[PDB]
Amino acid sequence: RPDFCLEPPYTGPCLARIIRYFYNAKAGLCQTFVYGGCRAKRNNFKSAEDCLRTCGGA
Amino acid sequence: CGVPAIQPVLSIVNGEEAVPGSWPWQVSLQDKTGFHFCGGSLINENWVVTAAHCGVTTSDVVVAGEFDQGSSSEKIQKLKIAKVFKNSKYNSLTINNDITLLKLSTAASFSQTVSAVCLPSASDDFAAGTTCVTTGWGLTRYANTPDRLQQASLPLLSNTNCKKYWGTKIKDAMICAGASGVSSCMGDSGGPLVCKKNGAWTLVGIVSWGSSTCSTSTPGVYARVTALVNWVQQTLAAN
Protein backbone atom coordinates (compact mmCIF):
# COMPACT_ATOMS: atom_id res chain seq x y z
CA ARG A 1 0.00 0.00 0.00
CA PRO A 2 1.04 3.66 -0.48
CA ASP A 3 3.25 5.16 2.22
CA PHE A 4 0.83 8.07 2.58
CA CYS A 5 -1.44 5.55 4.32
CA LEU A 6 0.97 5.55 7.25
CA GLU A 7 0.83 9.31 7.83
CA PRO A 8 -1.17 10.66 10.78
CA PRO A 9 -4.33 12.62 9.86
CA TYR A 10 -3.81 16.22 8.77
CA THR A 11 -6.40 18.87 9.66
CA GLY A 12 -4.70 21.69 7.79
CA PRO A 13 -4.78 25.50 8.29
CA CYS A 14 -8.38 26.14 7.22
CA LEU A 15 -11.00 26.40 9.95
CA ALA A 16 -13.89 24.19 8.89
CA ARG A 17 -15.06 21.09 10.77
CA ILE A 18 -15.36 18.54 7.96
CA ILE A 19 -15.58 14.84 8.75
CA ARG A 20 -13.10 12.76 6.76
CA TYR A 21 -11.55 9.32 7.08
CA PHE A 22 -7.92 8.31 7.45
CA TYR A 23 -6.30 4.90 7.68
CA ASN A 24 -4.85 4.07 11.10
CA ALA A 25 -2.16 1.42 10.60
CA LYS A 26 -2.02 0.83 14.36
CA ALA A 27 -5.59 -0.47 14.36
CA GLY A 28 -5.89 -1.64 10.77
CA LEU A 29 -9.06 0.40 10.31
CA CYS A 30 -10.07 3.71 8.82
CA GLN A 31 -11.19 6.22 11.43
CA THR A 32 -12.81 9.63 11.35
CA PHE A 33 -11.01 12.91 11.96
CA VAL A 34 -11.76 16.60 11.55
CA TYR A 35 -10.44 18.15 8.33
CA GLY A 36 -10.10 21.93 8.10
CA GLY A 37 -11.18 22.16 4.47
CA CYS A 38 -7.94 22.85 2.63
CA ARG A 39 -4.55 21.34 1.76
CA ALA A 40 -5.65 17.76 2.44
CA LYS A 41 -2.92 15.12 2.46
CA ARG A 42 -3.62 11.84 0.67
CA ASN A 43 -4.65 9.83 3.75
CA ASN A 44 -7.91 11.77 3.72
CA PHE A 45 -11.06 10.17 2.28
CA LYS A 46 -14.72 11.15 1.97
CA SER A 47 -15.89 7.63 2.85
CA ALA A 48 -14.63 4.72 4.93
CA GLU A 49 -14.99 2.50 1.86
CA ASP A 50 -12.69 4.68 -0.27
CA CYS A 51 -10.19 4.69 2.58
CA LEU A 52 -10.25 0.89 3.03
CA ARG A 53 -9.95 0.29 -0.74
CA THR A 54 -6.89 2.53 -0.89
CA CYS A 55 -5.13 1.86 2.40
CA GLY A 56 -6.51 -1.36 3.85
CA GLY A 57 -3.76 -3.61 5.15
CA ALA A 58 -1.08 -0.92 5.14
CA CYS B 1 -29.20 45.12 6.94
CA GLY B 2 -26.56 45.29 9.66
CA VAL B 3 -28.97 46.33 12.41
CA PRO B 4 -29.83 43.54 14.90
CA ALA B 5 -33.29 43.70 16.49
CA ILE B 6 -31.51 42.39 19.59
CA GLN B 7 -28.41 44.46 20.36
CA PRO B 8 -25.24 42.46 21.00
CA VAL B 9 -23.26 43.02 24.20
CA LEU B 10 -19.49 42.90 23.79
CA SER B 11 -16.78 42.72 26.49
CA ILE B 12 -13.49 30.98 18.81
CA VAL B 13 -10.74 30.70 21.42
CA ASN B 14 -10.97 33.19 24.30
CA GLY B 15 -14.19 34.71 23.02
CA GLU B 16 -17.45 34.96 24.96
CA GLU B 17 -21.02 33.71 24.71
CA ALA B 18 -23.18 35.99 22.58
CA VAL B 19 -26.54 37.44 23.55
CA PRO B 20 -29.11 35.09 21.97
CA GLY B 21 -30.11 36.30 18.51
CA SER B 22 -27.82 39.35 18.56
CA TRP B 23 -26.05 38.27 15.34
CA PRO B 24 -29.17 37.49 13.21
CA TRP B 25 -27.21 36.90 9.99
CA GLN B 26 -25.08 34.12 11.50
CA VAL B 27 -26.12 30.74 10.14
CA SER B 28 -24.85 27.23 10.78
CA LEU B 29 -24.08 25.08 7.75
CA GLN B 30 -24.89 21.45 8.56
CA ASP B 31 -24.97 18.13 6.74
CA LYS B 32 -28.14 16.07 6.36
CA THR B 33 -27.74 14.72 9.91
CA GLY B 34 -27.43 18.11 11.57
CA PHE B 35 -23.65 18.09 11.90
CA HIS B 36 -22.21 21.63 11.93
CA PHE B 37 -19.18 21.97 9.63
CA CYS B 38 -19.11 25.69 8.85
CA GLY B 39 -20.67 29.06 9.54
CA GLY B 40 -22.15 31.53 7.07
CA SER B 41 -23.84 34.93 6.79
CA LEU B 42 -27.26 35.79 5.37
CA ILE B 43 -26.96 38.70 2.90
CA ASN B 44 -30.69 38.71 2.13
CA GLU B 45 -33.66 36.33 2.37
CA ASN B 46 -32.45 34.02 -0.41
CA TRP B 47 -28.66 34.08 -0.21
CA VAL B 48 -25.91 33.06 2.21
CA VAL B 49 -22.22 33.87 1.82
CA THR B 50 -19.61 31.48 3.22
CA ALA B 51 -16.11 30.16 2.50
CA ALA B 52 -15.24 28.19 -0.62
CA HIS B 53 -13.14 25.68 1.34
CA CYS B 54 -16.24 24.66 3.32
CA GLY B 55 -17.23 22.60 0.27
CA VAL B 56 -20.97 23.11 0.72
CA THR B 57 -23.27 21.03 -1.52
CA THR B 58 -27.02 21.02 -2.18
CA SER B 59 -27.27 18.11 0.26
CA ASP B 60 -26.24 20.38 3.13
CA VAL B 61 -28.61 22.74 4.91
CA VAL B 62 -28.57 26.30 6.20
CA VAL B 63 -29.74 26.71 9.78
CA ALA B 64 -30.86 30.23 10.62
CA GLY B 65 -31.96 31.78 13.90
CA GLU B 66 -29.89 29.39 16.00
CA PHE B 67 -28.12 30.12 19.28
CA ASP B 68 -27.86 26.88 21.29
CA GLN B 69 -27.08 23.91 19.04
CA GLY B 70 -27.58 21.66 22.05
CA SER B 71 -31.20 22.77 22.47
CA SER B 72 -33.77 20.59 20.70
CA SER B 73 -36.67 22.88 21.62
CA GLU B 74 -35.09 26.10 20.32
CA LYS B 75 -36.99 27.36 17.28
CA ILE B 76 -34.85 27.60 14.15
CA GLN B 77 -35.16 27.57 10.37
CA LYS B 78 -33.68 24.61 8.50
CA LEU B 79 -33.33 25.89 4.94
CA LYS B 80 -32.61 23.73 1.90
CA ILE B 81 -29.94 24.85 -0.57
CA ALA B 82 -31.06 25.19 -4.18
CA LYS B 83 -27.68 25.87 -5.76
CA VAL B 84 -24.06 26.46 -4.75
CA PHE B 85 -21.98 29.18 -6.39
CA LYS B 86 -18.30 28.66 -5.63
CA ASN B 87 -16.09 31.49 -6.88
CA SER B 88 -14.30 29.99 -9.90
CA LYS B 89 -11.20 31.93 -8.90
CA TYR B 90 -10.88 30.10 -5.58
CA ASN B 91 -7.30 28.84 -5.45
CA SER B 92 -7.23 25.48 -3.64
CA LEU B 93 -3.48 25.85 -3.23
CA THR B 94 -3.03 29.41 -1.92
CA ILE B 95 -6.56 29.60 -0.47
CA ASN B 96 -7.07 32.96 -2.20
CA ASN B 97 -10.58 34.08 -3.24
CA ASP B 98 -12.11 31.86 -0.55
CA ILE B 99 -15.80 32.62 -1.04
CA THR B 100 -18.97 30.78 -2.05
CA LEU B 101 -22.59 31.86 -2.37
CA LEU B 102 -25.53 29.67 -1.42
CA LYS B 103 -28.93 30.24 -3.04
CA LEU B 104 -31.75 28.92 -0.85
CA SER B 105 -34.56 26.81 -2.30
CA THR B 106 -37.02 28.53 0.03
CA ALA B 107 -36.44 32.04 1.36
CA ALA B 108 -35.63 32.52 5.03
CA SER B 109 -38.30 34.28 7.09
CA PHE B 110 -36.61 37.35 8.54
CA SER B 111 -37.45 38.20 12.14
CA GLN B 112 -36.01 39.52 15.39
CA THR B 113 -33.41 36.72 15.31
CA VAL B 114 -32.97 36.30 11.55
CA SER B 115 -31.84 39.09 9.22
CA ALA B 116 -29.06 40.16 6.86
CA VAL B 117 -25.60 41.62 7.30
CA CYS B 118 -24.63 44.54 5.07
CA LEU B 119 -22.11 44.13 2.26
CA PRO B 120 -19.34 46.71 1.72
CA SER B 121 -18.56 48.58 -1.48
CA ALA B 122 -15.49 47.35 -3.37
CA SER B 123 -13.79 50.68 -2.61
CA ASP B 124 -14.54 50.72 1.12
CA ASP B 125 -11.52 51.21 3.34
CA PHE B 126 -11.58 49.64 6.79
CA ALA B 127 -8.47 50.97 8.52
CA ALA B 128 -6.05 48.72 10.36
CA GLY B 129 -6.67 48.88 14.09
CA THR B 130 -10.42 49.06 13.59
CA THR B 131 -12.16 46.93 16.23
CA CYS B 132 -14.42 44.41 14.51
CA VAL B 133 -16.20 41.24 15.62
CA THR B 134 -16.25 37.61 14.51
CA THR B 135 -18.77 34.98 15.58
CA GLY B 136 -19.32 31.24 15.34
CA TRP B 137 -19.60 27.80 16.95
CA GLY B 138 -15.98 26.81 16.34
CA LEU B 139 -13.81 25.27 19.06
CA THR B 140 -13.17 27.42 22.13
CA ARG B 141 -10.18 25.23 23.00
CA TYR B 142 -7.71 23.63 20.60
CA ALA B 143 -12.49 18.71 21.80
CA ASN B 144 -16.10 19.36 20.81
CA THR B 145 -17.68 22.63 19.68
CA PRO B 146 -19.49 24.89 22.17
CA ASP B 147 -23.29 24.57 22.05
CA ARG B 148 -23.89 28.31 22.29
CA LEU B 149 -22.83 30.93 19.74
CA GLN B 150 -19.59 32.70 20.64
CA GLN B 151 -18.26 36.14 19.73
CA ALA B 152 -14.97 38.02 19.98
CA SER B 153 -13.84 41.58 19.34
CA LEU B 154 -10.52 41.84 17.48
CA PRO B 155 -8.52 44.42 15.51
CA LEU B 156 -8.00 44.46 11.75
CA LEU B 157 -4.32 44.17 10.88
CA SER B 158 -2.37 45.99 8.18
CA ASN B 159 -1.11 43.74 5.40
CA THR B 160 2.42 44.75 6.37
CA ASN B 161 1.95 43.58 9.95
CA CYS B 162 0.16 40.41 8.91
CA LYS B 163 2.95 39.59 6.49
CA LYS B 164 5.46 39.96 9.33
CA TYR B 165 4.23 36.52 10.34
CA TRP B 166 2.63 34.87 7.29
CA GLY B 167 4.92 36.36 4.66
CA THR B 168 4.01 35.74 1.03
CA LYS B 169 1.15 33.42 1.99
CA ILE B 170 -1.05 36.52 2.30
CA LYS B 171 -2.75 37.17 -1.05
CA ASP B 172 -4.79 40.08 -2.44
CA ALA B 173 -8.20 38.69 -1.52
CA MET B 174 -7.24 38.10 2.12
CA ILE B 175 -7.44 40.40 5.13
CA CYS B 176 -6.02 39.63 8.57
CA ALA B 177 -7.33 40.33 12.04
CA GLY B 178 -6.55 39.17 15.56
CA ALA B 179 -3.25 38.14 17.13
CA SER B 180 -4.86 39.99 20.03
CA GLY B 181 -5.73 37.30 22.56
CA VAL B 182 -8.52 35.61 20.62
CA SER B 183 -8.62 33.31 17.59
CA SER B 184 -11.09 31.76 15.17
CA CYS B 185 -10.86 27.96 15.32
CA MET B 186 -12.17 24.77 13.68
CA GLY B 187 -15.87 25.19 12.98
CA ASP B 188 -15.72 28.98 12.57
CA SER B 189 -14.85 28.91 8.84
CA GLY B 190 -17.30 30.67 6.55
CA GLY B 191 -18.53 32.76 9.45
CA PRO B 192 -18.51 36.58 9.52
CA LEU B 193 -15.91 39.17 10.46
CA VAL B 194 -17.98 42.35 10.78
CA CYS B 195 -17.11 46.00 11.33
CA LYS B 196 -19.44 48.98 11.64
CA LYS B 197 -19.89 51.24 8.62
CA ASN B 198 -21.88 54.34 9.52
CA GLY B 199 -23.41 52.40 12.40
CA ALA B 200 -24.39 49.27 10.46
CA TRP B 201 -22.57 45.95 10.81
CA THR B 202 -20.91 45.20 7.48
CA LEU B 203 -19.21 42.01 6.29
CA VAL B 204 -15.50 42.80 5.96
CA GLY B 205 -14.20 39.24 6.09
CA ILE B 206 -15.15 35.56 6.03
CA VAL B 207 -13.32 33.20 8.40
CA SER B 208 -10.80 31.36 6.21
CA TRP B 209 -7.56 30.06 7.73
CA GLY B 210 -4.84 30.74 10.27
CA SER B 211 -2.82 29.17 13.07
CA SER B 212 -3.05 25.38 12.88
CA THR B 213 -3.36 25.35 16.69
CA CYS B 214 -5.64 28.38 16.93
CA SER B 215 -2.96 30.44 18.69
CA THR B 216 -4.27 33.77 19.99
CA SER B 217 -0.99 35.57 19.28
CA THR B 218 -1.04 34.84 15.54
CA PRO B 219 -2.93 36.74 12.81
CA GLY B 220 -6.17 35.13 11.68
CA VAL B 221 -6.80 35.25 7.94
CA TYR B 222 -10.15 36.03 6.35
CA ALA B 223 -11.42 36.32 2.80
CA ARG B 224 -11.40 40.07 2.03
CA VAL B 225 -14.99 40.86 1.11
CA THR B 226 -14.21 44.21 -0.54
CA ALA B 227 -12.09 42.32 -3.07
CA LEU B 228 -14.86 39.79 -3.71
CA VAL B 229 -18.05 41.83 -3.41
CA ASN B 230 -18.25 42.70 -7.11
CA TRP B 231 -18.27 38.96 -7.82
CA VAL B 232 -21.03 38.65 -5.22
CA GLN B 233 -23.26 41.36 -6.71
CA GLN B 234 -22.71 39.96 -10.21
CA THR B 235 -23.68 36.46 -9.11
CA LEU B 236 -26.87 37.70 -7.47
CA ALA B 237 -27.80 39.86 -10.46
CA ALA B 238 -27.40 36.88 -12.79
CA ASN B 239 -29.38 34.48 -10.60
mmCIF file of N, CA, C and O in Angstrom, chain A residues 3-54:
data_model
loop_
_atom_site.group_PDB
_atom_site.id
_atom_site.type_symbol
_atom_site.label_atom_id
_atom_site.label_comp_id
_atom_site.label_asym_id
_atom_site.label_seq_id
_atom_site.Cartn_x
_atom_site.Cartn_y
_atom_site.Cartn_z
ATOM 1 N N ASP A 3 2.711 4.688 0.955
ATOM 2 C CA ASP A 3 3.250 5.157 2.224
ATOM 3 C C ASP A 3 2.404 6.272 2.841
ATOM 4 O O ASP A 3 2.450 6.484 4.056
ATOM 5 N N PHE A 4 1.635 6.991 2.025
ATOM 6 C CA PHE A 4 0.825 8.073 2.582
ATOM 7 C C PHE A 4 -0.221 7.522 3.552
ATOM 8 O O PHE A 4 -0.753 8.251 4.387
ATOM 9 N N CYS A 5 -0.481 6.223 3.450
ATOM 10 C CA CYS A 5 -1.443 5.554 4.318
ATOM 11 C C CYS A 5 -0.947 5.472 5.754
ATOM 12 O O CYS A 5 -1.734 5.253 6.673
ATOM 13 N N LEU A 6 0.360 5.631 5.934
ATOM 14 C CA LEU A 6 0.972 5.546 7.255
ATOM 15 C C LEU A 6 1.127 6.900 7.944
ATOM 16 O O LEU A 6 1.602 6.971 9.079
ATOM 17 N N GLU A 7 0.725 7.969 7.265
ATOM 18 C CA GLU A 7 0.829 9.312 7.833
ATOM 19 C C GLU A 7 -0.341 9.637 8.756
ATOM 20 O O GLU A 7 -1.485 9.280 8.476
ATOM 21 N N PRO A 8 -0.070 10.319 9.877
ATOM 22 C CA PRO A 8 -1.170 10.661 10.781
ATOM 23 C C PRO A 8 -2.108 11.625 10.056
ATOM 24 O O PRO A 8 -1.709 12.271 9.087
ATOM 25 N N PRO A 9 -3.367 11.719 10.504
ATOM 26 C CA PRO A 9 -4.332 12.618 9.864
ATOM 27 C C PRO A 9 -3.882 14.075 9.925
ATOM 28 O O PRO A 9 -3.258 14.509 10.899
ATOM 29 N N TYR A 10 -4.213 14.823 8.882
ATOM 30 C CA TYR A 10 -3.814 16.218 8.772
ATOM 31 C C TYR A 10 -5.026 17.140 8.635
ATOM 32 O O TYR A 10 -5.720 17.123 7.616
ATOM 33 N N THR A 11 -5.268 17.949 9.661
ATOM 34 C CA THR A 11 -6.401 18.867 9.658
ATOM 35 C C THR A 11 -6.185 20.041 8.709
ATOM 36 O O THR A 11 -7.106 20.456 8.005
ATOM 37 N N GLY A 12 -4.968 20.575 8.681
ATOM 38 C CA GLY A 12 -4.701 21.693 7.792
ATOM 39 C C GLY A 12 -4.944 23.037 8.458
ATOM 40 O O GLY A 12 -5.440 23.094 9.583
ATOM 41 N N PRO A 13 -4.614 24.143 7.773
ATOM 42 C CA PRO A 13 -4.780 25.504 8.290
ATOM 43 C C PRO A 13 -6.166 26.137 8.180
ATOM 44 O O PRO A 13 -6.431 27.143 8.840
ATOM 45 N N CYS A 14 -7.042 25.573 7.353
ATOM 46 C CA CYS A 14 -8.383 26.135 7.222
ATOM 47 C C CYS A 14 -9.209 25.774 8.450
ATOM 48 O O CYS A 14 -8.940 24.775 9.125
ATOM 49 N N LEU A 15 -10.225 26.581 8.731
ATOM 50 C CA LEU A 15 -10.995 26.402 9.950
ATOM 51 C C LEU A 15 -12.379 25.785 9.898
ATOM 52 O O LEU A 15 -13.244 26.139 10.699
ATOM 53 N N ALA A 16 -12.594 24.857 8.975
ATOM 54 C CA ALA A 16 -13.885 24.192 8.889
ATOM 55 C C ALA A 16 -13.843 22.983 9.825
ATOM 56 O O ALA A 16 -12.819 22.707 10.449
ATOM 57 N N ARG A 17 -14.960 22.274 9.919
ATOM 58 C CA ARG A 17 -15.059 21.091 10.767
ATOM 59 C C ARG A 17 -15.692 20.026 9.876
ATOM 60 O O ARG A 17 -16.863 19.673 10.031
ATOM 61 N N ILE A 18 -14.901 19.533 8.928
ATOM 62 C CA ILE A 18 -15.358 18.542 7.961
ATOM 63 C C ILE A 18 -14.919 17.127 8.323
ATOM 64 O O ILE A 18 -13.735 16.862 8.520
ATOM 65 N N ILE A 19 -15.884 16.218 8.408
ATOM 66 C CA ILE A 19 -15.579 14.836 8.753
ATOM 67 C C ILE A 19 -14.981 14.079 7.575
ATOM 68 O O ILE A 19 -15.583 13.992 6.504
ATOM 69 N N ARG A 20 -13.786 13.540 7.784
ATOM 70 C CA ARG A 20 -13.104 12.760 6.763
ATOM 71 C C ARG A 20 -12.571 11.490 7.409
ATOM 72 O O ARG A 20 -12.609 11.344 8.631
ATOM 73 N N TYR A 21 -12.088 10.570 6.584
ATOM 74 C CA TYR A 21 -11.545 9.316 7.084
ATOM 75 C C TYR A 21 -10.067 9.186 6.773
ATOM 76 O O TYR A 21 -9.600 9.648 5.734
ATOM 77 N N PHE A 22 -9.331 8.557 7.682
ATOM 78 C CA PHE A 22 -7.918 8.315 7.455
ATOM 79 C C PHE A 22 -7.646 6.889 7.899
ATOM 80 O O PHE A 22 -8.342 6.357 8.766
ATOM 81 N N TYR A 23 -6.642 6.266 7.299
ATOM 82 C CA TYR A 23 -6.298 4.904 7.675
ATOM 83 C C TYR A 23 -5.348 4.936 8.867
ATOM 84 O O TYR A 23 -4.355 5.664 8.861
ATOM 85 N N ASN A 24 -5.674 4.158 9.896
ATOM 86 C CA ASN A 24 -4.855 4.066 11.101
ATOM 87 C C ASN A 24 -4.173 2.702 11.097
ATOM 88 O O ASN A 24 -4.780 1.696 11.471
ATOM 89 N N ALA A 25 -2.915 2.670 10.674
ATOM 90 C CA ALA A 25 -2.163 1.422 10.601
ATOM 91 C C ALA A 25 -2.051 0.696 11.939
ATOM 92 O O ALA A 25 -1.904 -0.527 11.974
ATOM 93 N N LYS A 26 -2.123 1.440 13.038
ATOM 94 C CA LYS A 26 -2.021 0.834 14.363
ATOM 95 C C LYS A 26 -3.220 -0.056 14.675
ATOM 96 O O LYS A 26 -3.098 -1.048 15.394
ATOM 97 N N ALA A 27 -4.376 0.296 14.126
ATOM 98 C CA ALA A 27 -5.594 -0.466 14.358
ATOM 99 C C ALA A 27 -6.004 -1.301 13.154
ATOM 100 O O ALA A 27 -6.736 -2.280 13.294
ATOM 101 N N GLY A 28 -5.534 -0.913 11.971
ATOM 102 C CA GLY A 28 -5.890 -1.642 10.767
ATOM 103 C C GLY A 28 -7.248 -1.220 10.237
ATOM 104 O O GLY A 28 -7.833 -1.886 9.383
ATOM 105 N N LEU A 29 -7.760 -0.106 10.747
ATOM 106 C CA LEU A 29 -9.057 0.397 10.313
ATOM 107 C C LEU A 29 -8.985 1.864 9.929
ATOM 108 O O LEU A 29 -8.044 2.569 10.286
ATOM 109 N N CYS A 30 -9.992 2.314 9.195
ATOM 110 C CA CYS A 30 -10.068 3.712 8.822
ATOM 111 C C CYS A 30 -10.910 4.345 9.916
ATOM 112 O O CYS A 30 -11.900 3.765 10.369
ATOM 113 N N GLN A 31 -10.490 5.517 10.363
ATOM 114 C CA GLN A 31 -11.187 6.216 11.427
ATOM 115 C C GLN A 31 -11.516 7.625 10.971
ATOM 116 O O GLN A 31 -10.970 8.114 9.982
ATOM 117 N N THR A 32 -12.413 8.273 11.696
ATOM 118 C CA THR A 32 -12.807 9.629 11.350
ATOM 119 C C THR A 32 -11.883 10.638 12.012
ATOM 120 O O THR A 32 -11.249 10.351 13.030
ATOM 121 N N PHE A 33 -11.798 11.818 11.411
ATOM 122 C CA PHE A 33 -11.013 12.911 11.962
ATOM 123 C C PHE A 33 -11.601 14.197 11.400
ATOM 124 O O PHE A 33 -12.371 14.167 10.438
ATOM 125 N N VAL A 34 -11.259 15.320 12.016
ATOM 126 C CA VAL A 34 -11.761 16.603 11.554
ATOM 127 C C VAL A 34 -10.767 17.233 10.580
ATOM 128 O O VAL A 34 -9.598 17.437 10.913
ATOM 129 N N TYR A 35 -11.245 17.525 9.375
ATOM 130 C CA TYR A 35 -10.436 18.145 8.328
ATOM 131 C C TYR A 35 -10.836 19.621 8.248
ATOM 132 O O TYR A 35 -12.024 19.949 8.282
ATOM 133 N N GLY A 36 -9.842 20.502 8.149
ATOM 134 C CA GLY A 36 -10.100 21.933 8.100
ATOM 135 C C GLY A 36 -10.680 22.477 6.804
ATOM 136 O O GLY A 36 -11.166 23.608 6.770
ATOM 137 N N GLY A 37 -10.619 21.696 5.732
ATOM 138 C CA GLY A 37 -11.179 22.158 4.472
ATOM 139 C C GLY A 37 -10.201 22.471 3.356
ATOM 140 O O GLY A 37 -10.609 22.624 2.202
ATOM 141 N N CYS A 38 -8.917 22.583 3.674
ATOM 142 C CA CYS A 38 -7.937 22.855 2.633
ATOM 143 C C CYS A 38 -6.588 22.179 2.847
ATOM 144 O O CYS A 38 -6.204 21.867 3.977
ATOM 145 N N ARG A 39 -5.876 21.954 1.747
ATOM 146 C CA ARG A 39 -4.550 21.337 1.765
ATOM 147 C C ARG A 39 -4.538 19.916 2.324
ATOM 148 O O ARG A 39 -3.621 19.531 3.051
ATOM 149 N N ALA A 40 -5.552 19.136 1.974
ATOM 150 C CA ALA A 40 -5.650 17.761 2.444
ATOM 151 C C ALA A 40 -4.460 16.919 1.985
ATOM 152 O O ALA A 40 -3.961 17.089 0.871
ATOM 153 N N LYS A 41 -3.990 16.026 2.850
ATOM 154 C CA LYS A 41 -2.916 15.121 2.463
ATOM 155 C C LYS A 41 -3.658 13.947 1.830
ATOM 156 O O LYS A 41 -4.890 13.938 1.812
ATOM 157 N N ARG A 42 -2.940 12.951 1.326
ATOM 158 C CA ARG A 42 -3.615 11.842 0.666
ATOM 159 C C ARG A 42 -4.366 10.853 1.557
ATOM 160 O O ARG A 42 -5.313 10.213 1.095
ATOM 161 N N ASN A 43 -3.961 10.730 2.820
ATOM 162 C CA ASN A 43 -4.653 9.834 3.754
ATOM 163 C C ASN A 43 -5.827 10.644 4.309
ATOM 164 O O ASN A 43 -5.901 10.974 5.499
ATOM 165 N N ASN A 44 -6.739 10.973 3.407
ATOM 166 C CA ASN A 44 -7.914 11.775 3.721
ATOM 167 C C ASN A 44 -8.951 11.331 2.694
ATOM 168 O O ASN A 44 -8.776 11.560 1.496
ATOM 169 N N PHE A 45 -10.015 10.684 3.164
ATOM 170 C CA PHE A 45 -11.059 10.175 2.281
ATOM 171 C C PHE A 45 -12.457 10.632 2.686
ATOM 172 O O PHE A 45 -12.726 10.886 3.860
ATOM 173 N N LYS A 46 -13.349 10.727 1.705
ATOM 174 C CA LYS A 46 -14.717 11.153 1.970
ATOM 175 C C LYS A 46 -15.593 10.019 2.492
ATOM 176 O O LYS A 46 -16.676 10.262 3.020
ATOM 177 N N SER A 47 -15.130 8.782 2.347
ATOM 178 C CA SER A 47 -15.888 7.635 2.847
ATOM 179 C C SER A 47 -14.941 6.586 3.407
ATOM 180 O O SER A 47 -13.777 6.514 3.010
ATOM 181 N N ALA A 48 -15.441 5.775 4.333
ATOM 182 C CA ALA A 48 -14.629 4.722 4.926
ATOM 183 C C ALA A 48 -14.283 3.703 3.845
ATOM 184 O O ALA A 48 -13.185 3.146 3.832
ATOM 185 N N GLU A 49 -15.223 3.462 2.935
ATOM 186 C CA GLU A 49 -14.994 2.497 1.862
ATOM 187 C C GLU A 49 -13.816 2.906 0.974
ATOM 188 O O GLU A 49 -12.964 2.077 0.652
ATOM 189 N N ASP A 50 -13.779 4.175 0.568
ATOM 190 C CA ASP A 50 -12.687 4.678 -0.270
ATOM 191 C C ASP A 50 -11.361 4.476 0.461
ATOM 192 O O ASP A 50 -10.364 4.047 -0.119
ATOM 193 N N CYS A 51 -11.367 4.809 1.745
ATOM 194 C CA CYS A 51 -10.185 4.689 2.579
ATOM 195 C C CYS A 51 -9.705 3.235 2.664
ATOM 196 O O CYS A 51 -8.522 2.955 2.469
ATOM 197 N N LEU A 52 -10.621 2.307 2.930
ATOM 198 C CA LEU A 52 -10.254 0.895 3.025
ATOM 199 C C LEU A 52 -9.769 0.309 1.697
ATOM 200 O O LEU A 52 -8.885 -0.546 1.682
ATOM 201 N N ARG A 53 -10.342 0.771 0.589
ATOM 202 C CA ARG A 53 -9.953 0.290 -0.741
ATOM 203 C C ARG A 53 -8.574 0.797 -1.158
ATOM 204 O O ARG A 53 -7.899 0.198 -2.000
ATOM 205 N N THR A 54 -8.160 1.905 -0.562
ATOM 206 C CA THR A 54 -6.886 2.526 -0.893
ATOM 207 C C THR A 54 -5.766 2.223 0.097
ATOM 208 O O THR A 54 -4.599 2.115 -0.286
#
